[PDB]
Structure formats: structure tokens, C-alpha cells
Amino acid sequence: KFNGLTVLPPLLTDEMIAQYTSALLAGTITSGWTFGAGPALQIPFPMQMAYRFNGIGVTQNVLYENQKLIANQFNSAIGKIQDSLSSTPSALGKLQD
Amino acid sequence: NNSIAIPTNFTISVTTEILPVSMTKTSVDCTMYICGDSTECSNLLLQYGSFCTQLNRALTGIAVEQDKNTQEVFAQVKQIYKTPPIKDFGGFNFSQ
Amino acid sequence: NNSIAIPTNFTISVTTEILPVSMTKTSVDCTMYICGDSTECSNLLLQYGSFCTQLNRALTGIAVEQDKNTQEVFAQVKQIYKTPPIKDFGGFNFSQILPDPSKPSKRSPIEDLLFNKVTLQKFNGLTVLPPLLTDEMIAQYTSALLAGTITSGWTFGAGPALQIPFPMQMAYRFNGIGVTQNVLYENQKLIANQFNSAIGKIQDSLSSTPSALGKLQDVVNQNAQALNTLVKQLSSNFGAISSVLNDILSRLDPPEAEVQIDRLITGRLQSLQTYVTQQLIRAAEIRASANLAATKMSECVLGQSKRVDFCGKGYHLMSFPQSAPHGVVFLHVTYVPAQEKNFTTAPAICHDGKAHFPREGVFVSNGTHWFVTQRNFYEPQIITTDNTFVSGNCDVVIGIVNNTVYDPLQP
Amino acid sequence: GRLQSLQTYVTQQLIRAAEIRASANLAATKMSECVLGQSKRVDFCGKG
Amino acid sequence: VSNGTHWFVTQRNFYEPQIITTDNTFVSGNCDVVIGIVNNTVYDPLQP
Amino acid sequence: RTFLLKYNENGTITDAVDCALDPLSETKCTLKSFTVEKGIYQTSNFRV
Amino acid sequence: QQFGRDIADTTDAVRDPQTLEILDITPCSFGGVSVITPGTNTSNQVAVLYQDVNCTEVNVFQTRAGCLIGAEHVNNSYECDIPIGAGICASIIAYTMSLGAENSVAYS
Ligand SMILES: *[C@@H]1O[C@H](CO)[C@@H](O)[C@H](O)[C@H]1NC(C)=O
Ligand SMILES: *[C@@H]1O[C@H](CO)[C@@H](O)[C@H](O)[C@H]1NC(C)=O
Numbered sequence: 001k002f003n004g005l006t007v008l009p010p011l012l013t014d015e016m017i018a019q020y021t022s023a024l025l026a027g028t029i030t031s032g033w034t035f036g037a038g039p040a041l042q043i044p045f046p047m048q049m050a051y052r053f054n055g056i057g058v059t060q061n062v063l064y065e066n067q068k069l070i071a072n073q074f075n076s077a078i079g080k081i082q083d084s085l086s087s088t089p090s091a092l093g094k095l096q097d
Numbered sequence: 098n099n100s101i102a103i104p105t106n107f108t109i110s111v112t113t114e115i116l117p118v119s120m121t122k123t124s125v126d127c128t129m130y131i132c133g134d135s136t137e138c139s140n141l142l143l144q145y146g147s148f149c150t151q152l153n154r155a156l157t158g159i160a161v162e163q164d165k166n167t168q169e170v171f172a173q174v175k176q177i178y179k180t181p182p183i184k185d186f187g188g189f190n191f192s193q
Numbered sequence: 194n195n196s197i198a199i200p201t202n203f204t205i206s207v208t209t210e211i212l213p214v215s216m217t218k219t220s221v222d223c224t225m226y227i228c229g230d231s232t233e234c235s236n237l238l239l240q241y242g243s244f245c246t247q248l249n250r251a252l253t254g255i256a257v258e259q260d261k262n263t264q265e266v267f268a269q270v271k272q273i274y275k276t277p278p279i280k281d282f283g284g285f286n287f288s289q290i291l292p293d294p295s296k297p298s299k300r301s302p303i304e305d306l307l308f309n310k311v312t313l314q315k316f317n318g319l320t321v322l323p324p325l326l327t328d329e330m331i332a333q334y335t336s337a338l339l340a341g342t343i344t345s346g347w348t349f350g351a352g353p354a355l356q357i358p359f360p361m362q363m364a365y366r367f368n369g370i371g372v373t374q375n376v377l378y379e380n381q382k383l384i385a386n387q388f389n390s391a392i393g394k395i396q397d398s399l400s401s402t403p404s405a406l407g408k409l410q411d412v413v414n415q416n417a418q419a420l421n422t423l424v425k426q427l428s429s430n431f432g433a434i435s436s437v438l439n440d441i442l443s444r445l446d447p448p449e450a451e452v453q454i455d456r457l458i459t460g461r462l463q464s465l466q467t468y469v470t471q472q473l474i475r476a477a478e479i480r481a482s483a484n485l486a487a488t489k490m491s492e493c494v495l496g497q498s499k500r501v502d503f504c505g506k507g508y509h510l511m512s513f514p515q516s517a518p519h520g521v522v523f524l525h526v527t528y529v530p531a532q533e534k535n536f537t538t539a540p541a542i543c544h545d546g547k548a549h550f551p552r553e554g555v556f557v558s559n560g561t562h563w564f565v566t567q568r569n570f571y572e573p574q575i576i577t578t579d580n581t582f583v584s585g586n587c588d589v590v591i592g593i594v595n596n597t598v599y600d601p602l603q604p
Numbered sequence: 605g606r607l608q609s610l611q612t613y614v615t616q617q618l619i620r621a622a623e624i625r626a627s628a629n630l631a632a633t634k635m636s637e638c639v640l641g642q643s644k645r646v647d648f649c650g651k652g
Numbered sequence: 653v654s655n656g657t658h659w660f661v662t663q664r665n666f667y668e669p670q671i672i673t674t675d676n677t678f679v680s681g682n683c684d685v686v687i688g689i690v691n692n693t694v695y696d697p698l699q700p
Numbered sequence: 701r702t703f704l705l706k707y708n709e710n711g712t713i714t715d716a717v718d719c720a721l722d723p724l725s726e727t728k729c730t731l732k733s734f735t736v737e738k739g740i741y742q743t744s745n746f747r748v
Numbered sequence: 749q750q751f752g753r754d755i756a757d758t759t760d761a762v763r764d765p766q767t768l769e770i771l772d773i774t775p776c777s778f779g780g781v782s783v784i785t786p787g788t789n790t791s792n793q794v795a796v797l798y799q800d801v802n803c804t805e806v807n808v809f810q811t812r813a814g815c816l817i818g819a820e821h822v823n824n825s826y827e828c829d830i831p832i833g834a835g836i837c838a839s840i841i842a843y844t845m846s847l848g849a850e851n852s853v854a855y856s
Contacts (some may be wrong), residue, residue: 001144003130004126004133005125005130006123008124010122010161010164020177020182023176025180026178026179026180027174027178028640030181033501034502038506039529039533041198041199043197044187044540044639045186046540046591047650055644056642059582061541063588065584065590067187070109073108074109077109078193079156079193080109081111081113082112112650114634116628117624118624118627125610128597129607142607144431144432145427146431147430149610151467152610152614156617159621170628172634179630187194249742255615272849272850272851273847277852277854277856281855281856283688320799322799322833323812324833326835330835335633337847340852342765343855345853359856360688378689380684424757462609466612474618478680481629500641501641572680602698723796727785734788736785739785739831740784745778745780746779746801747776748777748778748780
């Protein structure tokens, strides 16, 4: 705190921002994109992933025949992301800047 | 003209994109900052006029804009959705 | 893991999106503001060089930028399209959004309400250049866009306007969001009634909510406040013996009057530069808003947008443009899912050792029978080889249920 | 001198705030078209 | 589309008329719900 | 009078423009160029 | 009260001595002078636009943008080539801009 300087606290606290991110994650995992368009329509996550595959031009059978491999790749990528974000300095450099 | 390459397999990758949404809401009072606890400097400042009330308004606009930026980026959901108690996602792991 | 929720109904909602596209094209002068009618003051200003020329050039640039913003946002049609004389649109009502002959300014009731919702300087060397596109001409551009959308869908945006039946255009817009065309035709009267009711509610929402037009009034007030503070800064002394230039020039000898005049010129030029810089920042904000409005006019009005929330909450069907003072109001007609029911769902169905997956929509079970239905509307259909495709066996899919697939060739 | 310094700091903050607003607008568009939905636009939500 | 004597099914962005068949058209509901429809023969390829 | 003089590579004044002669010459003086392209140009201010 | 002040410290009015009448002081007419030119290469012909000036201070045409001389006002509209303002664009002829050719689609 200096002479003539003050820092107003943000209206949204980090915990409330984390609650917003948690709500968005819950909606994306449970209702896919339906919660964005309107009421949250529950859908099995493999079925939502299959429709996203259909959306990117790959038939939904491709995920179902490879559901275990796809889940294994997804888990490996998510775990690798934490390691990449922890072992790489300046990865959050944009916020630090 | 008669050859195409078609992928027989795929990799599901995850990419991290970091985007700043807000900055520190710093407020500076002109009368305290340029004229420290003295009246005569404040009287000399009043000849300058609305320069620093304009500066205070600009800082206030920046702070309000930062609050609006954070709200627009994160408050895109009318209701707070809650994750199901069981993590039965067909083998996808979201614990991280 | 085996339950889906599918809406058995839908609602046609209309959302108002107000975007400022321009501001008052204000401009100031080197001497009439900084100096007044004083030759000695102008000679002292000339020692500061082309500072005021830079300020005037910047203000001229922002005025031309406001003109360009309006032209880019509204002039997106090569030719003015005129609505057909008869309003045979399959029940859909556009009287609230089409221009009316009774109004001389040729403005739709929503547009006229928008102008009457907002409420509205040039005596101290200031000037407010008139906009290149007048109120009537911006309204004519908006009317042309409305006629093009209601008569050709998005084909007029792509190129030559192709005549389209509006119920059929709305049916293909329904097909565009993953809902089969038949659902609109079976429910055309219900959709038209919902559409008309939402359009009627739009007038009530605009006229009964204060600050609804605040996004435009805010910029208008900010420009007015900036001009008011700039002309109030002339009353400031900036440490000089008096704010008025004439009296201090008259009552002071040349070698101290010039010092006082220089102090006033430094203060007034700093005020003008601060105002010009703040106007440039506000012009950048309005330029971004106008770019967003032009992008919304191209994606939502000139066509159908598949990016969610870009043209209002819900599945965007189409939209209407409306003129507003220094702004545009978009009436986004969107499809929102309605009462929904959960259904036991399976990723694939095992028949004769073969896994069948739905070509479109998903498999659902109401308890005893399985059907294939579109995701956005509950229209159950008997499982057939026509709407399902077979790949692999039943031992690979994690979720498999047993049901009979009916191929019409066998009966 | 101090008022000129404060005006400069306010101007620098305003330009930085505009850049942060542009970043936040991009983040909101990414949240809508990548998280709330699926984007067909290439490289808007990552490679691939 | 109807050129004035016969009905056909064509892509919207190019005029390539084709006979109405069961493979390019899907049946939904009945004729007493859809508004503004006309009668025609849907040639079933399997029938001949 | 204010005059816009065009110097050549030798340094001789090959051409001149009288700013107060007529609005076109005043426009040439304002743009600091003998040839002006099609467009609107604010040159000075008329006040009574 | 001897003189009237409008918002932002402007001398809007003053009561005169020996008459007590209140006289409104409207600032003397002032405005920028814009030059309409097709380019010196094309032609030396020039039109003059006095911004926010009534056609009462020295072919003429009075527009919302001000008093424009040297260009003939023409009723029929063309695509804009030189900007003037107030929906008007510009021998030199001044015309109201035509936003686009009229095309009514035969809806059915
Ligand atoms: C595809 O690649 C994955 C590793 O990313 C591997 O486990 C899998 O066996 C591969 N499948 C085929 C068909 O090559
Ligand atoms: C996800 O991984 C974590 C740690 O690797 C593990 O504790 C957890 O059980 C996993 N999730 C499930 C559903 O097994």
C-alpha cells in the first residue's frame, strides 16, 4: 500500500471464478453443448464424444470400437498436460507478463 | 492426380491456451498523489481544473471494464451445474 | 451412462442485441478552441508546431472511421430489395419489423420505438459533422436487408437473390440446426404463432425496460460529457491569472502576457490532447463494436450461424436487423428446446450379431420399445436399415442392447 | 511534472486495458465456441 | 422442384433434377399435418 | 502572401502556387503537393 | 442578474444597460471550408463546401452539411465518388447517394 494508490478487490473472487469454471466443466461433461444452447440435456459422455466425432467428420462407430484406446489416450494427454504445465517455466508467462 | 493419403489411426491431443481476462483494478487519487496532504498545492491544482477528475473517471472505467471482462468470460451459464457424484464417464478420467 | 434427455417440444424465441456502430462525428479547431480570436495567441501556438494539426487530423480520421463503420455495418447489400406487396409468409407476421407506409420516415414500429426510447455543443469552435448515411437511408438499408432475409433467406447474401417460400426457408433453417424439415411443416401454425408472439413481446420488452437502449445512450452521453468537459476546461486557469484570454492580453504587458498566454496554451493544448486521445480510445472501442456488428450482420442476418451464442442464446435460426441512433439492434430468432423426456439410450443395437448405429439422431427406449429419433426433437421412428448403418459386431461396443432392425425389402 | 506522469500512466493503463479487453473478448469467444459448443473453425480451439 | 409438368428432387445450389425416390426422400407422419403439400408418385427403386 | 514553391534537383524554383489565389491553390498548399487526388479536403475556416 | 451563463461556462445572454432588455449572444457563424475536387489531373474545376454555414455568407446548394457552391444539385442519384456528408455525394454535380440498385424479389 503506497501514497495515493489502492487496489480494488475484484468483484468475482477466485473461489467464485473457480465455481464458475466447475459449473462449465460439469455442464460440458454431462450435457455436452446442449447446456450452452438451453436446458442441460444429460447425455452419456461416450455418446457426446461420438457426436463430437461425427461433428469432425469421423463416424461415431470409430470411437465406440476404440472407446478404451480413446479413453487411454485422453487420460494420458490430461496427465501429460499437468506435467507439461508444471515442468515448463513461462508456460503461464502471458498472465505473469 | 490419382493418389490420396488416408489416416488409419488417430491421436487425441490436449493443448493449453492461456488467455488473460483481467488486470489489477488499481485506483489512484489525483489530489493525494500529486499534492501530498497540503492545501496550497490543491489550490494550485484547482487552476488546472478537471484533468485528474477525468483521470479518476478513466481509472474507474478501466476497473469497471475489468469486472465486466471477467464476468463476460466466466459467467456464461445461467445455472451452476454440479458434477454427478459417480465418475462413470466410460473410462474418461476427469479427476485432474 | 444409458439415459438421454430429448425435448418433445420447442420454443421460437427472439432476443434483442443492441450494438453501437458509430458516434457523433465531432471536430475542433487549433485557434477557435486553444486560442480564440487572437493573432498573438495563434503566433505563440505556431511555436508549438503542428500539434493542433495532428489533433485535427486525428479527429478527421475518427470522423471518417465512423462513416466507414456505418457503411461497413449497413451497406452489405449490393441492391435494395423490396418486400412483396402481399404478406403471404405462411402465417409469419413481420409488420412489427417491416417499414410501414403510414410512417413518413418509413420506419418499422420496433425501429420507431427504438428512436423514441433514446433522448437527445457547437458554439465554442466545435463542429458536429452530419453522418454520411441519413436516418432514412440507414432505415432503407435495414428494410432492404429485412426484405432480402424474408424473401431469399441467405441466398441474397451469397449472391443473386433466389425467391424462397418463407415457411420452406424456415424449414431449411430448422434443418440447418439438426432438426428435420418435417417438424416445422407438421407444426407450422404453432411456430408462426410462437414467432408472432415473440415479435410482439419484443416491443413490450423494449418499451417497458428502462436502460434497454442504454448501450447506445451510454456512448451518446460519454461523447456529450467529453465535449462538456472540454469546453468547461476553457473556464480553467491552469495557473494563469485569469481563464479569459482577452482580459489578460489587454491588462498585461507583452513580456509577461506571453508567459501567461503560453501557460494557458499549454493547459488548453493538454486538455485538447487528452480529449482527442480519449476520443481515439472510445473510437477504437466503437470500431471494435462496429466490426462485431458487421460480423453479426454477415453471420446472423446475411446467413445462418452455427457458432452458439454468437447470435443469441439457443440454436440460432435467423435474425432481423433494425436501425438505431448510431447503432444497430439485432432481433435474433432462435430455436430453444422445450419440455424434454429422458429415454433409456444405447450406443448401438445388436441384431443378427451385427452392431447397428443410427445414421442420424440416437436410439431411445420409452420402456418397452426402441426407436431412432433426432436429438433436438422427440420424433420416434421404428428402427430400420434406412436410418441405421451396420459396422462390426456386438462384442466391441461397451453399451449394446438387443432389438430387431426392420428392412423394408424383407416384407 | 507529476500530473503529466499521472496522465502518462493513465494513458498506458488505458492502452493496456484495451489490449486486455481484446484478450478477454477472444477468451469469451473461445469459451462460447470451444467450451459451450464445438467449433468447426480451424486452430480457433487448438491444433487438429 | 416443379418445372411445370413433373416434380423432381434437386440440390438447392445447383439445378440437377432427379425423380422422387425412397432413397433421396424420407417419410415422416402423414399428409394431414404438413401445410401446403402436393400429391406425386414416389418411385420405389425396389418395386420394379 | 503564403507561397508553395516547387524546387527541382538543380534547386531552381520551377513552379509556384499562391495559397490565397483560389480554393484549388489553397488545397494544393494544405496538402503540401501541387497535384491533389480526388477527394474532400478541409483547408481553412470561414468565420464572419 | 446582469449576464446569463449557459452550461459549461458560456456567455449565452446579457441584460443591456439603459434598456434592461435581455439579449441572447449567439456566436458569430464559423465553419471549416472543404474543397470538392475530382483531382487536378482530371480537372481544375473546384467546388467549395462551408461546413455548418447557412447560404447567407459569401451555382449554390444548401445541405445539412452546410452551404456548397460550384456544384450543380441533380435530382437523380448515383453511386458516391466524393464524400460531402448528410447523405450527399458529388462539371461537378452534387447528388443524394444511391445506396444500391432497387431489386424486388418476386416472392411466392
Ligand atoms: C493406434 O495408435 C494407438 C496409440 O496411439 C495404438 O495403441 C493402437 O493400437 C493403434 N491402432 C491401430 C489400428 O494401429
Ligand atoms: C483417475 O486417476 C487418478 C490418479 O491417476 C485415480 O486416483 C482415479 O481413480 C482415476 N479415476 C478413476 C475413475 O478411476
